[PDB]
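Q: Structure for this?
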Amino acid sequence: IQLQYHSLLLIWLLTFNPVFANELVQKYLSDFLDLLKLVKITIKEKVSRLCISIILQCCSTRVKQHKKVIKQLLLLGNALPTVQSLSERKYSDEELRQDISNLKEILENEYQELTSFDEYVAELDSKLLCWSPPHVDNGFWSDNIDEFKKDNYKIFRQLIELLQAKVRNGDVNAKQEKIIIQVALNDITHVVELLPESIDVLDKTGGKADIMELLNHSDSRVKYEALKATQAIIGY
Amino acid sequence: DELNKMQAFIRKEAEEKAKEIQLKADQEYEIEKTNIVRNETNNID
């Protein structure tokens, strides 16, 4: 605990300089998420305050690309939900509570400009999907169907590439990998049902072959998702 | 699989049905084009 507190203090001191904070922001994209997880797990007021200060310094306006860094943190590490949970929780330390409130306000301001499309784009870039609300939201798919087909179906091509990578990674058949594969299959089925022009692009890019390969997967959920995608493709 | 084969066979039957429909529609269009050709001949006349 003492070593972790000293490391957090050193990180905050380094991040006090905007140039060093900006350099460390790109050094580890998951550093903010790890710090938030450590702050949530740790019950020490001093450690939580140091973690909050370090997180704020990275997203502080002094550091370069403050808005971009804040948006990336909120999209990847779920900074807004963690900050909202921390605000609801009661902290004995007044300085830690003030830092948590400031971080929550910053996260809310960053998320106000952001939308579900930005979150979906970030998830696609990170190649991580765990059945997000947008995937199961019919309205989100209806209002984002044109966006997916935009730029010569760039989003559809990215989804097809992610599905192909998951199929290549299907040998491991990890639970997270299986969930990602199922989410990608559901997204492909939605993009085929709505604006079926992407179906031809997926077939050209081997999406149908990937779905057929996933139809023989050992996992029951993956097999069911692949069967549903095949039914949406040409099935009744 | 078997389900895909039935769907593909249905598509094949639909395509075969569309082939007869396309031929019938094209034959009607050919007759219609001949009537339009008569109008073109009238314009030439």
